[PDB]
Design a protein around this ligand. Structure first.
Ligand SMILES: CC(=O)N[C@@H]1[C@@H](O)[C@H](O)[C@@H](CO)O[C@H]1O
Length: 341
């Protein structure tokens, strides 16, 4: 009695496992893209789906509200404080003299296009304070995996180094792909790197035995605050682009209370402390984040009547709506049209 929206064959597989062990309590709806899930839950042929901030924003505009959210810290959940996932931070080289004010024309390092930390928040922020939607021409050059092969945002990207170069590919083949990759891009070619708060740490002091990251220390980097002031890598709390919320399960409002109880029921058997976690573990997928982030310990209940605006938080909400004002998706446009806004 809960059609879950699975995206891709891998999630579908896991969703089938879940459907089986839950004794049909959970059914599965497979789609190609995550955005496809929003429509299917609207048409009632899907009940729930875990989304990231950007999609949550879209879902909300379409009238779908967050009902439960993942917690990545302690296994044990519902005690009223919306957990934070991480902080989106802009990093720069210590020995450089660049900052948020003279950022135009510099070289950037993004985790990948469409990503929350490396793209949505930064470009979302630049559009808000600048009014531009010309992201590809803001920076002189830069590496943003997933960008058009021949565009400034690909010039800084390296490839795999192998035969088929694969420059700018949104995959591990691209050296500058992901968080660790964006940092490396800053260390080797870029001016600024848009990653998360824990990135610099995870790759300094020798944690990363790689060559480019063997003699790197935290002091080699600084955070660029939106003031124009720079901060110590450890002060991300006082100098972050935005606080990113955890992924939220979104559903049609009238099925809100219904879905919670059924998911709680599911946690009780397949959660981290599931009575049956031995058969199937909801939050387990071999670090592949199938259905839920494997970093999930439990689902926290989002207060009833909580809209997407409240859940995302003003700052994040502002940057998302900001970014989306620039070439919005068909769904977002369709939903905004359907209403008054
Ligand atoms: C506090 C304030 O008024 N600023 C907001 C905030 O979303 C962000 O800090 C800024 C970008 O620098 O854009 C403005 O909309």
């Amino acid at each position: 009695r809960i059609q879950w929206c699975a995206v891709g064959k891998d999630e579908k597989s896991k969703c089938d496992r879940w459907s089986v062990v839950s004794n049909g309590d959970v059914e599965c709806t497979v789609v190609d893209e995550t955005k496809d899930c929003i429509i299917k839950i609207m048409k009632g042929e899907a009940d729930a789906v875990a989304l990231d901030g950007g999609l949550v924003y879209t879902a909300g505009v379409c009238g779908l509200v967050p009902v439960m959210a993942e917690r990545y810290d302690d296994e044990s959940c519902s005690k009223d404080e919306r957990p934070a996932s991480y902080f989106a931070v802009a990093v720069a080289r210590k020995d450089s003299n660049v900052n948020w004010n003279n950022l135009k024309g510099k070289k950037s390092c993004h985790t990948a296009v469409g990503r929350t930390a490396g793209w949505v928040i930064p470009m979302g922020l630049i559009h808000n304070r600048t009014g531009t939607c010309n992201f590809d021409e803001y920076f002189s050059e830069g590496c943003a995996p997933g960008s058009p092969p021949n565009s400034r945002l690909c010039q800084l990207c390296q490839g795999s180094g192998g035969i088929p170069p694969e420059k700018c590919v949104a995959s591990s083949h691209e050296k500058y792909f992901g968080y660790t990759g964006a940092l490396r891009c800053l260390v080797e070619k870029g001016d600024v790197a848009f990653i998360q708060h824990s990135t610099v740490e995870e790759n300094t002091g020798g944690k990363n035995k790689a060559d480019w990251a063997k003699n790197l220390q935290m002091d080699d980097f600084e955070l660029l605050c939106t003031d124009g002031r720079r901060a110590n890598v450890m002060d991300y709390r006082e100098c972050n682009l935005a606080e990113v919320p955890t992924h939220a399960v979104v559903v049609r409002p009238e099925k809100a209370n219904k879905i919670r109880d059924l998911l709680e029921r599911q946690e009780k058997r397949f959660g981290v402390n599931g009575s049956e976690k031995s058969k199937f573990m909801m939050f387990e997928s071999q670090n592949k984040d199938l259905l839920f982030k494997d970093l999930t310990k439990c689902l926290f209940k989002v207060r009833e009547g909580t809209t997407y605006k409240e859940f995302l938080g003003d700052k994040f909400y502002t940057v998302i709506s900001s970014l989306k004002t620039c070439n919005p998706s068909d769904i977002l446009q369709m939903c905004s049209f359907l209403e008054g806004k």
